[PDB]
Design a protein around this ligand. Structure first.
Ligand SMILES: *C/C=C(C)/C=C/C=C(C)/C=C/C1=C(C)CCCC1(C)C
Length: 227
């Protein structure tokens, strides 16, 4: 079949793969419980991305959706990855700053909406309605970034500077990477079809790997994960 984007699915599989192992090993050597908590979460994130990147490399998670007069290539496995990976990341951020149960619930729920409306949008046949769904998903994302920026940051000020520091970095990395997803989606295959599938896959692996292995590297080398 050899699709053009495959080289990127292969690089993503590999990066996600190397990251899950390194974290796994690091985490089972650690004895501190809290740190163990953070390790178990952060290692799972790329582990899942790894399976999905593998599937897509092997020909799964792809479907052709009709809209705009075309049979467009829609990688739906991505939402199968992000449905569980994005909330887990919010959780790491939530545990880092002592977020309350209610804040976490609303965050994940928001996240659930964002990924669901996003997939629904990527599956929609009427071109215009694709952007309606995309719109809701993005609005849901903004709520999440808001809580993380205004909420969390504020509560991270009750922690040690080392903890608030690790968090700001993590929060900052998240805000920049997440912000880029709706835009890639809008000018890509699910959207205006301006950017070709291959460049889009590369944009997505870069963000994905940056947001999971990048985020993890920073979180796990920090002494903030300890109780
Ligand atoms: C490891 C993957 C991560 C951290 C993925 C984050 C993904 C997003 C913030 C995705 C957002 C989307 C929208 C705001 C609307 C359109 C569809 C999505 C799912 C691409």
């Amino acid at each position: 079949t050899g699709r053009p984007e495959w080289i990127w699915l292969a690089l993503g599989t590999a990066l996600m793969g190397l990251g899950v192992l390194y974290f796994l090993v690091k985490g089972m050597g650690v004895s501190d419980p809290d740190a163990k908590k953070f390790y178990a979460i952060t290692t799972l994130v790329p582990a899942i991305a790894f399976t999905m990147y593998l599937s897509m490399l092997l020909g799964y998670g792809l479907t052709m959706v009709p809209f705009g007069g075309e049979q467009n290539p829609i990688y739906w496995a991505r939402y199968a990855d992000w449905l569980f990976t994005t909330p887990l990341l919010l959780l790491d951020l939530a545990l880092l700053v002592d977020a309350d149960q209610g804040t976490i619930l609303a965050l994940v729920g928001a996240d659930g909406i964002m990924i669901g409306t996003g997939l629904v949008g990527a599956l929609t046949k009427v071109y215009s309605y694709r952007f309606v769904w995309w719109a809701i998903s993005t609005a849901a994302m903004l709520y999440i970034l808001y809580v993380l920026f205004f909420g969390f940051t504020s509560k991270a000020e009750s922690m040690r500077p080392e903890v608030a520091s690790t968090f700001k970095v993590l929060r900052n990395v998240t805000v920049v990477l997440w912000s880029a997803y709706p835009v890639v989606w809008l000018i890509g295959s699910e959207g205006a079809g301006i950017v070709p599938l291959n460049i889009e896959t590369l944009l997505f692996m870069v963000l994905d790997v940056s947001a999971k292995v990048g985020f993890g590297l920073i979180l796990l080398r920090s002494r903030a994960i300890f109780g």
